[PDB]
C-alpha cells in the first residue's frame, strides 16, 4: 500500500517503527530464555500437542510459556485494575490522590508499580508451585523455598523488565507500550497455532469457512469498536459569533462498548474461584459437581459465563463512564446538553444513554467471549486455537490505535499554505 | 409491558450512534489484516532465527 511507503519516507516515523520492531525482537529473545532451576525437559514433555520451542507448551488448550517472561505484563494489568477499583470510594487516600491532579496521579502510578512487583511475586510463587504440581513435582529441581524464591524473583524481574520495555517503546517507539507488548504476545502465539491446524490436516473448505468467519468477526469488531454515540454539548462561555459552522462541533462521545475487555476479567475470576476453592478440599461429590458446572465449555457453565459478562459489563461501564462525575464536570466547566439542566438532569440523561449502549456492548462482548467454544465445537478445530476470543478485541484495538497514532504523526508534515 | 418499550428505546438509540461508513470500514479491516499478517510472518521469521542461533550457541 501507498501509506506504508509514506511512513518509511518520513524519517521520524520510520525511526520509531524500527525501534518498536527491535524492542519486539528483544521481547521474543527473552521469551526464549529459560528460568534458573526449572528443568526444561519435563516441561516440554507436559504438553498435549507439539508447540515450537522448548519453553512453549500446549496446556489446557492454551499456548503456555515458562521463560523469564512467563507472566508477561499480566501483574501490571491486574495491579492497574485493582488500583482503579480502589480509587472509587474504597481507599480514601487514593481518592484524594486522584483528586490532586498530574502529581497525585504520579503517586498512583508509583503505587501501581510497587503493587505490580508485589503481585508479580505472589503470582510467580503460585505459578511455579502450580506448574511443579502439574509436572508431578518433577518440574523444579531442589524443591526448597530458596529455589522457589529465586524463581519468583527472576519472573518478577522479567515482568519488571517488560514494563521498562513498555516505557521505552512508548517514549521512543510507535505507540503505547504495554499494549504493543500484549499485542506481541497474542500474535506471536499465532504461528504455532497455524502450525497445529496444518498438522491436523471437506476440511479445506471447512478451514476456508473458518477464515471467512474470522474476517467477518474482525469486521464486526471494528464496527462496534469504532462507533460513538455523540451527545452534543453547548458551552455558554464564549460569544461564538461570525457564522459558527456546526461541522466540527463540540460533543461528548460515548463508546458502544465503554468497558472494553475488563468485564471478562471479572467474569473469569468468578468462574475460576469455585474450582480452586473446591480443589483445596480434595475430591468429593460436590467438588466434582463444582468442577463440572463451572466449566464454560458446557452449557450451564457457558450460561453462567455469559450472565456474568453482561452483569460486569454494566458494572464496569458505569464505573468507567461514571455519569455522576460526568454531570458534575459538565456543570463545573459550564457546558450543558442542549435542553437539559446541567445538574441531576444531565446525569440521568446520560445514564439512560449508557443503559442502552451498554446493553448492545455487553451482548457483543459476551458473544465475542463465547465464540471460540463454538468454533472449536462446530469446526473440528483443535482446542489449542482459542480463535476469536477477547484476544481478538485486543489485537484489533491495538492495531487500529497504533495506525491512528502514526497518521497523526504523519499529518504534521503536510501544512500546505496558499502559495505552495 | 415495559421491556418491549425498553427494546424499542435501544433500537431507537442505535440509530443515533455514529457507526463507521463502508469506506473507512474497508480501510480499517485492511489495516487490521495487514498488521496481523505482517506480525504473524515477522514473529515466525524471528522465531526461526532465534531458534537457529540458539542451536548454534547452545
Amino acid at each position, epitope marked *: 500500500f501507498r501509506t506504508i511507503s509514506n511512513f518509511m519516507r518520513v524519517s521520524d516515523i520510520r525511526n520509531k517503527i524500527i525501534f518498536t520492531l527491535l524492542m519486539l525482537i528483544v521481547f521474543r529473545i527473552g521469551t*526464549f530464555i*529459560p528460568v534458573p532451576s526449572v*528443568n*526444561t*525437559d*519435563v516441561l*516440554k*514433555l*507436559q504438553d*498435549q500437542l507439539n508447540a515450537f520451542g*522448548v519453553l512453549n507448551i500446549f496446556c489446557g488448550g492454551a499456548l503456555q510459556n515458562f521463560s523469564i517472561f512467563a507472566m508477561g505484563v499480566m501483574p501490571y494489568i491486574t495491579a492497574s485494575i485493582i488500583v482503579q477499583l480502589l480509587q472509587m470510594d474504597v481507599v480514601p487516600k487514593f481518592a484524594e490522590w486522584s483528586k490532586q491532579g498530574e502529581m497525585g496521579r504520579r503517586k498512583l502510578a508509583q503505587f501501581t508499580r510497587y503493587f505490580t512487583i508485589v503481585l508479580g511475586f505472589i503470582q510467580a510463587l503460585g505459578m511455579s508451585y502450580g506448574f511443579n504440581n502439574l*509436572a*508431578g*513435582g*518433577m518440574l523444579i*529441581q531442589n524443591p526448597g523455598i530458596g529455589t522457589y524464591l529465586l524463581i519468583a524473583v527472576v519472573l518478577t524481574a522479567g515482568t519488571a523488565f517488560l514494563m521498562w520495555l513498555g516505557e521505552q517503546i512508548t517514549a521512543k517507539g510507535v505507540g503505547n507500550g504495554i499494549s504493543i507488548i500484549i499485542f506481541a504476545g497474542i500474535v506471536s502465539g499465532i504461528p504455532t497455532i497455524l502450525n497445529q491446524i496444518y498438522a491436523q490436516t471437506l476440511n479445506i473448505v471447512r478451514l476456508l469457512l473458518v477464515a471467512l468467519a474470522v474476517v467477518a468477526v474482525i469486521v464486526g469488531v471494528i464496527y462496534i469498536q469504532q462507533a460513538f454515540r455523540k451527545i452534543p454539548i453547548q458551552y455558554a462561555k464564549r460569544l461564538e459569533g461570525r457564522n459558527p459552522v456546526g461541522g466540527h462541533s463540540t460533543h461528548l462521545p460515548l463508546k458502544v462498548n465503554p468497558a472494553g475487555v475488563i468485564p471478562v476479567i471479572f467474569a473469569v475470576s468468578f468462574l475460576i474461584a469455585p474450582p480452586t476453592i473446591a480443589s483445596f478440599f480434595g475430591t468429593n461429590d460436590v467438588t466434582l459437581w463444582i468442577r463440572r458446572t463451572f466449566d464454560y465449555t458446557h452449557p450451564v457453565g457457558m450460561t453462567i459465563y455469559v450472565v456474568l459478562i453482561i452483569a460486569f459489563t454494566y458494572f464496569y461501564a458505569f464505573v468507567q463512564v461514571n455519569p455522576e462525575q460526568m454531570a458534575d464536570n459538565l456543570k463545573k466547566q459550564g457546558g450543558y446538553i442542549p435542553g437539559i439542566r446541567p445538574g441531576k438532569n444531565t446525569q440521568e440523561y446520560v445514564t439512560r444513554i449508557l443503559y442502552r449502549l451498554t446493553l448492545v456492548g455487553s451482548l457483543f462482548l459476551a458473544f465475542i467471549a463465547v465464540l471460540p467454544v463454538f468454533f472449536v465445537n462446530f469446526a473440528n478445530l483443535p482446542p489449542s486455537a482459542q480463535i476469536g476470543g477477547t484476544s481478538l478485541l485486543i489485537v484489533v484495538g491495538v492495531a487500529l490505535e497504533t495506525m491512528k497514532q502514526l497518521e497523526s504523526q504523519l499529518v504534521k508534515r503536510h501544512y500546505r499554505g496558499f502559495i505552495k | 409491558q415495559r421491556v418491549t418499550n425498553f427494546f424499542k428505546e435501544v433500537v431507537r438509540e442505535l440509530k443515533k450512534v455514529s457507526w463507521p461508513n463502508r469506506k473507512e470500514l474497508v480501510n480499517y479491516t485492511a489495516v487490521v489484516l495487514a498488521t496481523v499478517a505482517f506480525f504473524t510472518v515477522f514473529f515466525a521469521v524471528i522465531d526461526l532465527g532465534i531458534s537457529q542461533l*540458539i*542451536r548454534l550457541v*547452545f
Partner: nanobody
Amino acid sequence: QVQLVETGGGLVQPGGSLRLSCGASGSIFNMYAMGWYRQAPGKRREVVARIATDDSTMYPDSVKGRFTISRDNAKNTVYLQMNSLKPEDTAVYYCYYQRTVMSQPYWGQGTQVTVS
C-alpha cells in the same frame, strides 16, 4: 538422532519387579537430561524418572523409593529398575533423552509393561 531400543517389557505379577533397558546408539552422554515417562491410555504422561548430567536423580512421589535409575556412559544403556509393582503401574513406557537445556526432547518407541 540417537535411536532408543527400550527392552525389558514383560508381564509381571502385581507385587514384583522388572528391569527396563534403554539402549542408545550414539555415545557421548554429556547430555542435559535422560529419563523415562509412561503415557498410558488415560493420557498426560508422567515423567517417571530423570537423570541430570550431575547424576542428580529425581522421581515423583508416586514412584518414589520403588523405582531406581542407572546410567553408565560409554556403554549405551539407561536402566530403570522397577521394584514393588502394582496394577496401576500397568502402562507403556518411553525412554527419553535431551541434549542441552535448549534442545528438544526426542523420545523412543513403546515398551508395554503390563502388570497383572
